[PDB]
Each structure stands twice: as C-alpha cells, then as structure tokens.
Amino acid sequence: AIITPALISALKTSFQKHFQDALATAPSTYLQVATVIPSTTASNTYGWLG
Amino acid sequence: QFPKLREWIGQRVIKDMAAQGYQITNKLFESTVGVKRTDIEDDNLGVYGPLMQEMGRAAGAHPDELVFALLKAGNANLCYDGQNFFDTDHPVYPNVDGTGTATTVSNLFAPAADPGAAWYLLDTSRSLKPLIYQERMKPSFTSMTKEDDEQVFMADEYRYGVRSRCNVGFGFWQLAAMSTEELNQVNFEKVYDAMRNQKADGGRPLDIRPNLLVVPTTLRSKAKEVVGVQRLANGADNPNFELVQVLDTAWLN
Amino acid sequence: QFPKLREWIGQRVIKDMAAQGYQITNKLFESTVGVKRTDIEDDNLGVYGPL
C-alpha cells in the first residue's frame, strides 16, 4: 500500500508511440517547375545557337 | 526534426534535437441509481424496470459526452506545448501562432475544422476498462438488508479524454459562417488557409489538409451553404463547394 | 433516462430516476337531421335516398 511517490507513482505508466509521425511535411513540387541537370565540376557553362 | 540545411562556411554549428512528451492519467467514473424492493415488486404496470437498458445506453453514450465536452473546453484545457489547445499564443521557435479567432462583438457559436486524415486524429479518447455492471437482487446483499432495500444499479468505467497537436486543429472562430459574402467565404477560407499556412519547428510547412467541419445544430445551415451548394447567389460557382465534409453534432453548446 | 456518469471521489452518490404520465378522456359527438315523413315517402323522383 504505502510507497514512495517517486517509484510507483512514476513507473505506473505505459509508453506509447502513437504521437510519432502524426503530422507530415509539404510534398515535393520542384519537379513540376525545374529539370534536373547533373554536374561533374565546379560550374556548368551553357551555350546555344541563334 | 533534423536541422535545416545550411551553407557551409568555416566550421559547422553542431545543433541539438528537441524531444517532446505528453502525459495524461486515467480517471474513474460511475453512475448509480437506487430503488426499493416494494417499489419494483409492486410495479404491476411494468414501466419501472427498463433501468437495465437505460443504464446500458447511458454507459454507451458516456464517451460521446466526454469527447465533445473536451472539444467544447479546448479553449481552457492545455495541449502538450503548454498553452490552451485553442489559443492565440501557440509558440514556435521565436514566433507566436494563434489557432483561435474571436471578434469581441458577435461570438455565439464556434465551428470546428479538423484534418482527420492524419494517422492521429483530434481529441483522442483512451479506454482502459470496458463497461461493467452489478445488481442487488438477492436476499444476502448488505444493501438488501440495510434498509427496506437499496437495489442499486451502477456503472464502473475508467476513461479520460485526450488531445493531440494543437496546431493541426482550428476550432474556435465565432465571428460568423453565413452571409451574402465575407462570412460565407472569408471566415471559412481564412481558417482553411491559416491551417494550410502553418510552420513547423525548424521552418518547414506542416502540410495540413482540413477535411472535417464540425458545427452545432444551430450553425448547420451556415456550414451547408459554405459547403454543399454548387451554384452561387449570383449564379456562379461556390469555390468552396465539396471542399470539406461537414458533420452536425448536438453534444456541443 | 439514467443519470450521467460522475467522477469517482470517495463514495457512490445514489441518484434518482423519474417517470412521466399523460391522460385524456374520450368524448361523445353527434350529427342529427330531421325530415318529414310525407316529404320523403312521396318522393317519386328519388331525389331523397342518398341521405
């Protein structure tokens, strides 16, 4: 019956992870407005003919 | 959340994470009704012993009362961060955010918008113990011999209402919900866009998708014109038609 | 209806229930028509008869 309130009153709990990943983040969208051009050096120079 | 990407200048700034916790304890509940032996045993009409089924349906209806009372009192009870679930001062890293709008002029009934799509819903409930009942219908009972009789019928239940993120929910805008304009569209699209414009700890959008609109029976007509009418008063479209599904409940206000 | 649930603090609070009653008594009505024997018993065209 009688017991310190720092052992039983502390350990009478059940940890659950329902709250984990409850919310999300905005989906990727840069694909719809940009192309992917891989690079192999410090910079990329572009040139086109008129 | 992991710290945001930074431009590499000099050394690195080693940052820290932020773990959060929510604690909530079970509560004890009971409803008990006492009658007399002579009353029931002299009841030849038979309109005095639906007590069993009345008590059963009361036990069944208790969770509705708990959850919707918590929804009502969301402006008073606190969420995990430290403020009220519906408060104007929800804290972000340096910033302050509000999820409750008032007018100080006309604030009568509050509609609620709940993005229930997420894995964790709003105003959750916890069920530690199912319902259990007991009677006093034998001679050997202490109550049966305490007076003429005390034929008590009671319920035992361990429950308590819970809540969740107090930024995914916007459930107090008592300004108005229906008019020719600026109440039908403004104060509803305002809630929708404010919830879709939330910012997480770190500087990332929350990606909120409001889908449920909860209103009392008195504001159902306003809610239905806001969502559920295809045309407009001038013959045009309602841009908010079929935007969110509305639910009418009588457990609030 | 059964009383609502109450938080457990110390002792069970024995509650009371109620029953209601309604009553109404029947009433007697009438409609009466008076006709003359010679008026209808001499009716040869059948004007009277749907009475």
Add this chain to the structure above:
Amino acid sequence: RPLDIRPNLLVVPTTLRSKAKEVVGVQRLANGADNPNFELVQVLDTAWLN
C-alpha cells in the same frame, strides 16, 4: 443528452401551398442558384386548415 429529432413533413393550408412549395420544391432560387432546402421536407396540402 441531445434528442434526435428529424423533421420530415411540413403541413400548410391551401393558401400557403404555393409558399411552401416555393420554399421546398424549387431547385433554382433567383439566378440559377441552388436551393439549400430542396427535398428535405415533404409538404402536405390539406383543405382542413384555416
């Protein structure tokens, strides 16, 4: 606890029959708008009223 009440019948005399049908019975209000009160309550027209 809340009471479940579901109105389903509107009772009017003959003189108010046109008003009742206009309130419930017409799908377009003024400019092609949609009547929010269309097909929710069935109107009853009886001459035993006023």
